[PDB]
């Protein structure tokens, strides 16, 4: 309606030209005209300027008009490498699958590209959290000890117990 | 802090344990203590699973809590989980998970000798050297089951032995380092 | 309550097999004083 109703569309209809490719940047008074908003209130238009342009992660601004920020998102199979390495050296977090695929279009080549390198844990939901594989140290063994490791209960011992072995077997 | 029990935590926690265990050891590892909340940010784990995880490192005690209470500012109550490593109290589960193991090892020599050769095909029940002689028909002159009436064989018994040989080699040189760690952390 | 023990100092569920190893741990004597006979 009024003050929600038309910043939207402004914000909808951004979106839709950027897939077009078109990165040249677009005026407050540009957009209002594809968007069918030239009635938009005097009070919006310098909201819209003062904080719903450079507020929003998805808006840059440039030589003074505003274009879409694709470099935040991720577009390239080196992106994709580099950001996840950010989020392991900073600690940062892991990334659901599916903020990736809509930032990169056909994102299963990039994935599929780096193989290993993206480390995917599957939530529940069926949603995949993809981390940095760190390769520094890696070490594996067979199932038969994984699973022998496991068959060697310790959560039902106490410490004394645990303590005395040490000295039982002398070590 | 002595660099080589950091080194030490970090080689048995990426061998034995998922990515998800280490990623919480190099936030301690970095700050002496780190609240449970603060973790769970950076990690943005889920909050059951960054206490499963938790449940598992304080079940085989490579690392303490202590609980701290205080009053918020908006005056209800807080209780902060606050999370240490205890590399005195780390080292001998270590210790005590690689001892057990190389017992075992020598327990595995012991069972290659008791294992149970004689079975019968039909029930598809192994018995014991010992056992067959008590199962031998003197009228047929060779080895029989009571239950089938069938005949005894021991030649499918004979090849899972060796499998087990091969795993005392390789076990104790893959632990080589674990062990040379261990040597450099008596101090 | 019901068939599981709770524990409080704070408060952790006790579940049957963190009991069985305390009572492992009782040597024989004991449980006479106890007045329960050990074999
Ligand atoms: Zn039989």
Redesign the interface.
Known sequence: GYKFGVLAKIVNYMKTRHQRGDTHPLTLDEILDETQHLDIGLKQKQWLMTEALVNNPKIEVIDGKYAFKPKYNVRDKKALLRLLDQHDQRGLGGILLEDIEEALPNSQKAVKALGDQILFVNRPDKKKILFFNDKSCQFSVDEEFQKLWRSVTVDSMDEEKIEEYLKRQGI | VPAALKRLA??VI???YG?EHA?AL??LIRNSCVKEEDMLE?????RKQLRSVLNNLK???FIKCRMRVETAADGKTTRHNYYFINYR?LV??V???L???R??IETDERDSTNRASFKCPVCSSTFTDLEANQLFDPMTGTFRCTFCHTEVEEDESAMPKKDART?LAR?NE?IEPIYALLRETED | SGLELYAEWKKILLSPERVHEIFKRISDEECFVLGMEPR
């Open positions: 970090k080689y990426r061998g034995f990515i990623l190099d936030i950076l990690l943005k784990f889920d079940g085989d005690k109290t001998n589960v210790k005590y998970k001892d057990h193991m017992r075992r795993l076990f893959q």
